[PDB]
Amino acid sequence: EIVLTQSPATLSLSPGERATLSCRASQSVSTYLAWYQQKFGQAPRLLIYDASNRATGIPARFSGSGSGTDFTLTISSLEPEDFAVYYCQCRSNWPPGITFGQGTRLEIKRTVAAPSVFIFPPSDEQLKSGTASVVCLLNNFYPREAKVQWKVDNALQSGNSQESVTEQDSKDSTYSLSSTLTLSKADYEKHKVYACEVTHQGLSSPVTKSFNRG
Amino acid sequence: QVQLVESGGGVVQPGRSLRLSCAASGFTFSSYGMHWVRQAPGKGLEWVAVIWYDGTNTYYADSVKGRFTISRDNSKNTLYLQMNSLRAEDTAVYYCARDLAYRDYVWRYFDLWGRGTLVTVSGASTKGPSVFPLTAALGCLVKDYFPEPVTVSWNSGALTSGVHTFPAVLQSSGLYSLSSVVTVPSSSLGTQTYICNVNHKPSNTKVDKRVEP
Amino acid sequence: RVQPTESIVRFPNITNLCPFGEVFNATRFASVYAWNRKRISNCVADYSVLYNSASFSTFKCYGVSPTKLNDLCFTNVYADSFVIRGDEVRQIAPGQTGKIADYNYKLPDDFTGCVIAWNSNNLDSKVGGNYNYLYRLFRKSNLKPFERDISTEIYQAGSTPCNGVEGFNCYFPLQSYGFQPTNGVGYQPYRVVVLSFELLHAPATVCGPKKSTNLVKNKCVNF
Ligand SMILES: *[C@@H]1O[C@H](CO)[C@@H](O[C@@H]2O[C@H](CO)[C@@H](O[C@@H]3O[C@H](CO[C@H]4O[C@H](CO)[C@@H](O)[C@H](O)[C@@H]4O[C@@H]4O[C@H](CO)[C@@H](O)[C@H](O)[C@H]4NC(C)=O)[C@@H](O)[C@H](O[C@H]4O[C@H](CO)[C@@H](O)[C@H](O)[C@@H]4O[C@@H]4O[C@H](CO)[C@@H](O)[C@H](O)[C@H]4NC(C)=O)[C@@H]3O)[C@H](O)[C@H]2NC(C)=O)[C@H](O)[C@H]1NC(C)=O
Ligand SMILES: *[C@@H]1O[C@H](CO)[C@@H](O[C@@H]2O[C@H](CO)[C@@H](O[C@@H]3O[C@H](CO)[C@@H](O)[C@H](O)[C@@H]3O)[C@H](O)[C@H]2NC(C)=O)[C@H](O)[C@H]1NC(C)=O
User: Fold this and answer.
1) I need a labelling partner for B134 at 20 to 30 A (CA). Which of B174, B186, C2, C83 fits?
2) Domains in chain A: ranges and CATH
3) Which of C10, C11, C13 to mutate to test the pocket of ligand 2 (most atoms within 8 A of CB)?
4) Which string of b and e fits B11-36 if b means at least 16 CB within 10 Å?
């Protein structure tokens, strides 16, 4: 069974430069691996099949190379149609099937910009329905990786709050994050200080946004 | 006219069945092989099934081995795909796909893709969203809604810049939620009134509320 | 006497797979003009190993769905072995023109057989090219179906015959492929085979697999 190994996990670069991805297949496949380009929400379209053939509808700026268990795609000059995710796929015999990769996301260089942290205390409106929810919002940060921790009596709560990140907006090439903790009303009354901690590459020290109510 | 258009997107309970269809057009249906690839929410592509250009022999992934049926009826130039014994993981965007090769049996590349149809599974029943409250930023958090999609706007879309609408996520209760926010100048805080207008078309629950500190 | 349907049964069990690895996995094939061929008989022809091996490249078969073939049993299986230029692969088909179709190989028309080919660059090449494969450029007319010619007799473009020794216009028939480990996809060495299923009014055929099923006993009258 062939299980595709993709490197680097992600790419971040300015347009106009040379972007080279690697897909090292687990075991030899001769000449058979193909590349798929998916913009967020759009329909994936084949780019390369046979690992050096430039499929139709592909401007000549797209090049790929490799055979056996080394396969890499190169792009000479990135323009916004190409800042997307990208996959490598190939096929298998035992059990017969097809293996895709894990995916490789593309990001734009710009001036590294630290977050604006906000915290949104729970509203009494939700209390009318017997549930408590609190959202901690991180704004205009880069790179994607970041970290959020709740503190209620210094207790770090994990597995109880769902964090979502929007995809890179066009205008400023930035990200936004926000994580909503869901809590039983009883866990709402049990304490009065609620605080959120942010830790990110753009921050010299952890950044705390908090409030005292309950 | 060389396109595929999928069909049959929907919601069903676990243990029951659904059958989808893909419409083909612009090309000879009975000369190319067809695949079904499913894109689970927030994850990568996972091949599901294939069919030879004459549908005489077919292959299925392990996760659906013995549970799904792939078949093509060239009479209407429609591809189909049945499901049996659906479980929770099966939620996905099913992209019907086209083989690359003309009259070849290899079936190794996907050269042309249907737009992808939502398919979702849960025991929850359709229920409208509960939009809830909350320089300086603010917005409304939208809670406990099922199924998708929900389209948010500020002042019926009067403003769009510095606006974030966040992906829906699934919580254990069987519903979805998200939130929508925007940053405003601090000085604007009391000067200007903000009303968040949100639509959820399938239940047509048009509820709109002002945000006031 | 009789009973509800389900009790019917199959599989007068046998086994003994046969030399299809020994043709697909040969260490070396002969060239086009010297295309190899061999009789295969008195075996079960298991193609379910052929399909699902995901190491073939441009695998098609005319005239019958192969999966439905596996029940239909033929005899005198005779299958080929040779190698072709990267582009030329498609041209080995019934009723097709080109360069091979005239002077190196002609497939019989209305051919219900298989053409299985592939890419092989990892072994059929070396630094500077493995000059062990040659092809013909000239011949007096078209070829018949499934016949060979290896010869030092040459075409005469002009009037005066070339007396054996190559000259400016003798056009010595055989020229070699130049394969490089870096050349383009269209120029890769495609190692290919072909099967034909000829039952030439020939009793005592030899048949193929019919995979299995698992017995259930103590149920009468149905077989
Ligand atoms: C040209 O040459 C090619 C390469 O030499 C060759 O490809 C090879 O083709 C053979 C065809 O038989 C094929 O063998 C099969 O293997 C099946 C799965 O086992 C493999 O492969 C998987 C994934 O590839 C690995 O996970 C396995 O570990 C094993 O690979 C290796 O195993 C060795 C020894 O353990 C390890 O040291 C290696 O590390 C390991 N590789 C890796 C990468 O880790 C196997 O299931 C097949 O047999 C069964 O077929 C059916 C299921 O598909 C069953 O119904 C059937 O009963 C068979 O089950 C048993 O198979 C046993 C095999 O030893 C028998 O002893 C048992 O008797 C039998 N059961 C019964 C009841 O009888 C099959 O053996 C190779 O995988 C394949 N490899 C490659 C790289 O291509 C081509 O076929 C050649 N050409 C032609 C025309 O043949
Ligand atoms: C029918 O197909 C089978 C499939 O391999 C052929 O193999 C052998 O079948 C015999 C049947 O008597 C098995 O004999 C016994 O099986 C038991 C249980 O498996 C085992 O414990 C004994 O030691 C003994 O071998 C035999 O196991 C089986 N082969 C293997 C490797 O297990 C059989 O030859 C086929 N029959 C005909 C008539 O073609």
Assistant:
1) B174
2) 5-108 (2.60.40.10), 116-212 (2.60.40.10)
3) C13
4) beeeeeebebbbbbeeeebeebbbbb
In B63-134, at which residue ranges do the beta strands (DSSP E only) sit?
68-73, 78-83, 92-99, 110-113, 117-121, 130-132
Task: Give B74→chain A minimum CA distance, Å.
Answer: 24
Resolution in A: 4.3
CATH 2.60.40.10 fits B3-121, yes or no: yes
On the question of a common fold for B3-121 and B130-211, the answer reads: yes
Determine how many CB atoms are found less than 10 A away from the CB of residue C191: 22
Residue C140 Cα, gap to closest chain A Cα (Å): 37
Q: Which residue has the tokens 């046969």?
A: C18
The CATH classification number of B130-211 equals 2.60.40.10
Resolved by:
cryo-EM
**Cβ atoms B52, B79 nearer than 8 A:** no
List, as one string, the DSSP characters of A144-189: S--EEEEEBTTBPP-SSEEEEEPPPPTTT--EEEEEEEEEEHHHHH
Domain boundaries, chain B: 3-121, 130-211
Q: Which residues of A touch B140 (CB under 8 A)?
A: none
Place of tokens 């053939």: A53
Distance from chain centroid for Cα C118: 11
Interface size A-C, in CB pairs within 8 Å, comes to 35
The pair of structure tokens assigned to B168 is 């829906």
Instruction: Verify whether ligand 1 is closer than 6 Å to residue C65 (CB atom).
Output: no
**Rounded Cα–Cα distance for residues B139 and B95 (Å):** 34
Which residues, at least 6 apart from C86, have a Cβ–Cβ distance to it below 8 Å? C184, C185, C186, C187, C188, C189, C190
Size of interface A-B (CB pairs under 8 A): 103
Cα torsion at C103, C107, C109, C112 (round to 10°)?
A: 180
Q: Are strands C190-196 and C134-136 parallel, antiparallel or unpaired?
A: unpaired
The verdict on a CB contact (< 8 Å) between C122 and A68 is: yes
CA distance A25 to A3: 7
Q: Do A46 and B47 touch (CB under 8 A)?
A: no
Q: Nearest Cα to B33, choosing from B49, B58, B48, B52?
A: B52
User: Distance from C56 to chain B by nearest Cα, in Å?
Assistant: 7
Ligand nearest to the CA of C12: 2
**Residue C186 near ligand 1, beta carbon < 6 Å:** no
Tell me which H or E stretch contains C67. Answer: helix C66-69
